[PDB]
Design an enzyme around this catalytic site. Structure first.
Site, PDB file in Angstrom:
ATOM      1  N   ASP A  21      56.437  58.537  92.463  1.00  0.00           N
ATOM      2  CA  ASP A  21      56.080  57.410  91.603  1.00  0.00           C
ATOM      3  C   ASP A  21      55.218  56.428  92.386  1.00  0.00           C
ATOM      4  OD1 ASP A  21      55.929  55.442  89.754  1.00  0.00           O
ATOM      5  OD2 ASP A  21      58.029  54.794  89.949  1.00  0.00           O
ATOM      6  N   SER A  55      38.685  49.585  86.575  1.00  0.00           N
ATOM      7  CA  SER A  55      37.789  50.544  85.948  1.00  0.00           C
ATOM      8  C   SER A  55      36.565  49.823  85.398  1.00  0.00           C
ATOM      9  CB  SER A  55      38.522  51.272  84.812  1.00  0.00           C
ATOM     10  OG  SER A  55      37.654  52.105  84.065  1.00  0.00           O
TER      11      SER A  55
END
Length: 330
Positions: free
Chosen positions: A35, A199
């Site tokens: 994770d 992004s």
């Protein structure tokens, strides 16, 4: 040193991926969910409340000659999905894919929430976010990667998750045969303890690319792609019959639909998520309503590039003094 381990989907939907981890002496092999959105290595154990164990493999520290109680240390964690676990702490030897760390904090669960009990395939979590998020008290502990870093050939790990297939986690090296083209690296902020990046925009299907900054985290422990409501609405508007269902808890679409791809930007590069990757199947057995793999982050507080996005790429987690993320197509 290096390590390399295969990671395998737990079910036919790629809801999560499990990777075998050797703990203790002699080794006890547990299948852990790696994770990158958390920083605790915790396991089902001989100390876990018996009614809360249902098929998981447990770590028994009393059977490990290298286990030592970390005196006074406790831990307690709550995840973004509302699940939780807590317990005490041992140090022991932990190996992943041939890479060994001695003195790793292994957090032994005394209690786990129902979602963990109900998933017999996941024996615990191995956190790979920054050690500033580790929950051990009163002395915070380091992640497996942080402990291994100095010994690694290069201070990196990579995630290469498969679509409906096994993939690979590598530590200490970048497998140049595992991706196509080049790797585009992008800046990371560690201010929240995550692999947080920005992004450069998105496209839906064959549509034009929209240049827009989208801050979010690269999180291998989250199944889906969680993005701003504007972006998610633009995606599902291209699927006839798709709608957001408050009763189901997100966007659903007709199982007869063909889904468009979704592209996200990494600098000037582009990662394409095929439409198939966005189908999470019937909402309940036999239903013709299917659950979408792109969902709104509006109620989370952060955008999350979970497995839906990451499995479309070869992803480099560069843990150099100034960390960065790299993405390549594959």
């Amino acid at each position: 040193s290096t390590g390399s381990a295969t990671t395998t989907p737990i079910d036919s939907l790629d809801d999560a991926y499990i990777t075998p981890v050797q703990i203790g002496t002699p080794a006890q092999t547990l299948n852990l969910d790696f994770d990158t959105g958390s920083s605790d290595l915790w396991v089902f154990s001989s100390e876990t409340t018996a009614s809360e164990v249902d098929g998981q493999t447990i770590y028994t520290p009393s059977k490990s000659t290298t286990a030592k109680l970390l005196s006074g240390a406790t831990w307690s964690i709550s995840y973004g999905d509302g699940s939780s676990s807590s317990g005490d702490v041992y140090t022991d030897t932990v190996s992943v894919g041939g890479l060994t760390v001695t003195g790793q904090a292994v957090e032994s669960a005394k209690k786990v929430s129902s979602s963990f009990t109900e998933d017999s395939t996941i024996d615990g979590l191995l956190g790979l976010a920054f050690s500033t998020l580790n929950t051990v008290s009163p002395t915070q502990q380091k992640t497996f990667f942080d402990n291994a870093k100095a010994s690694l050939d290069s201070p990196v790990f990579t995630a290469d998750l498969g679509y409906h297939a096994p993939g690979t986690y590598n530590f200490g090296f970048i497998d140049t045969t595992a991706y196509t083209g080049s790797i585009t690296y992008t800046a990371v902020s560690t201010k929240q303890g995550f692999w947080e990046w920005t992004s450069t925009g998105y496209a839906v299907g064959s549509g034009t690319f929209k240049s827009t900054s989208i801050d979010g985290i690269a999180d291998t422990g989250t199944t889906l792609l969680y993005l701003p409501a504007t972006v998610v609405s633009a995606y599902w508007a291209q699927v006839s019959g798709a709608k957001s269902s408050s009763s189901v808890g997100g966007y659903v679409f007709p199982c007869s639909a063909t889904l468009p791809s979704f592209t996200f930007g990494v600098g000037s590069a582009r990662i394409v998520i095929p439409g198939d990757y966005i189908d999470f199947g019937p909402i309940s057995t036999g239903s013709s309503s299917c659950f979408g793999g792109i969902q709104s982050s509006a109620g989370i507080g952060i955008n999350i590039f979970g497995d839906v996005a990451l499995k479309a790429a070869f992803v480099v987690f560069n843990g150099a003094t100034t960390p960065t993320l790299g993405f390549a197509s594959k």
